[PDB]
Amino acid sequence: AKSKNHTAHNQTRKAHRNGIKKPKTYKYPSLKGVDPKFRRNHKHALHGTAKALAAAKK
Amino acid sequence: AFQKDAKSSAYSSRFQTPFRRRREGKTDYYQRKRLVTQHKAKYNTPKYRLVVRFTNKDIICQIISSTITGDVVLAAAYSHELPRYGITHGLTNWAAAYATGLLIARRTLQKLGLDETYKGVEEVEGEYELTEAVEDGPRPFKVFLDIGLQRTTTGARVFGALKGASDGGLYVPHSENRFPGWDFETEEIDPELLRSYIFGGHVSQYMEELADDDEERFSELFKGYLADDIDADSLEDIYTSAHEAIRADPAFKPTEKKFTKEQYAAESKKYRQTKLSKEERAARVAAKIAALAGQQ
């Protein structure tokens, strides 16, 4: 055998066809990984303020 | 210094100077880090250390927080304030530590608003406890003991500041085993030895064992307890009422001054040498170059 071992040749050519797409941002990122203490409370700090905007809306 | 001494250009060039306050041996940073730094989830919640520093015969108790701009002092109570509370001698002693740490405890608790709440142990029998949690009401003021460079030894007198600051009502977490009366040989505290110490009963027990076995020394030391005639057995009630005075009025009367910064400025600026100009330097050198040449 003895056939070529490796190269990056052409590889940016293929990469750029469909073009290195930007990360695609949103508002409201997911909390994945955020500390469980913060989150567990933050659940009630939200559930809590939803009742407060139900009663107050009447 | 010496000849085969005298560091080179290299050694200087490549030298790395420690911090000023490690170069002055005043600050152990490996401890300061672990004390001051705050849980990153508690954000700008300050970490509050109780700094206890003995000079030679004076005591400092400072509740301090920290900024990148430098640390900030809540309030301080030095031992040398103790005369206004009726202690005129032995201000460097364990029972004065206790006295000063209790003055610093009320003073801060005063200025904060927790003064009427959290009165600490008022009876002061020297039993081992720490100030508890008021139910339905603010948590006690939590402050941490900064021992400085003090060796931690059971019965050492930094922990007097502790006991008095705890008994003042501040929250200062701690254990017993550094309190005089902690038995090496058993898990026990004997708070009777600790109450005696709180009131100076180890110093008062000294005068007695002195007065009859040496009056030559007893002339030397306790000399102030003679000229003012406060004798050995009278000591415990000096302190016992000093706490009364303490919780009465923590408020920190500042010194009356007598003169002013401008005055103290001028009188001190009398004594400091002003820096020479470069023109002045070019003079002396050109003066030395005239001197040493021409057959000296």
């Binding site: - | 050198v285 030395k288 170059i289 040493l292 040449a293 021409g294």
Partner: protein, 212 residues
């Protein structure tokens, strides 16, 4: 047993000297880099003529030796073995390798050290010589003779300076008859205008006249 000097002439590979990871390398064929009267004082020999490389190439030690020997061997037997000072101005720290020895599994070619060579720049000095201006032509032809031992082009140039110092003849004679130059071995030392004034004057007592 040596490969012709062609094979190693150009500077192809990264400088690879005797090293903690080399260790195996031979002895340089050149050893002694200063010849003639080498304690001679800075004012004894004003004149300086360099040998200058016109190429970016590699001189072998064994060439450096043969040119050193050659030039000196002449320069002494014309103007005398104290007449000059010959300073080889380049050193051979670059280790040349050789791969000594169809076939099969499996080649690997790394060389064992075959020799040493001095990497030279264009306009980098091979030889410096100092003598008295009286002795010029003898030195020049002496360098012109060692020239033939070196691959590729090199040139000889009368130095604008005073011997091996960093000063031109007039600017040197300035600091000389002013009190600023003191003898050290073959070289000199110079009066600092900065530093401790104390031993500044301990040295250079010749100074602190402010006259001839």
């Amino acid at each position: 047993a040596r490969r012709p000097a062609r094979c190693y002439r150009y500077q192809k590979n990264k400088p690879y000297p005797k090293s903690r990871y080399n260790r195996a390398v031979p002895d340089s064929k050149i050893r002694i880099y200063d010849l003639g009267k080498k304690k001679a004082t800075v004012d004894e020999f004003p004149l300086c003529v360099h040998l200058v490389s016109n190429e970016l190439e590699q001189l072998s030690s064994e060439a450096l030796e043969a040119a050193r020997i050659c030039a000196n061997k002449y320069m002494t037997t014309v103007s005398g073995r104290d007449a000059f000072h010959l300073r080889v101005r380049v050193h051979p720290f670059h280790v040349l390798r050789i791969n000594k020895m169809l076939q099969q599994g499996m080649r690997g070619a790394w060389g064992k050290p075959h020799g040493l060579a001095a990497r030279v720049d264009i306009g980098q000095i091979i030889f410096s010589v100092r003598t008295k201006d009286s002795n010029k032509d003898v030195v020049v032809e002496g360098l012109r003779r060692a020239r033939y031992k070196f691959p590729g082009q090199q040139k000889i140039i009368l130095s604008k300076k005073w011997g091996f110092t960093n000063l031109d003849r007039p600017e040197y004679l300035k600091k000389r008859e002013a009190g600023e130059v003191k003898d050290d071995g073959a070289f000199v030392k110079f009066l600092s205008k900065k530093g401790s004034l104390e031993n500044n004057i301990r040295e250079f007592p010749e100074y602190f006249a402010a006259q001839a």
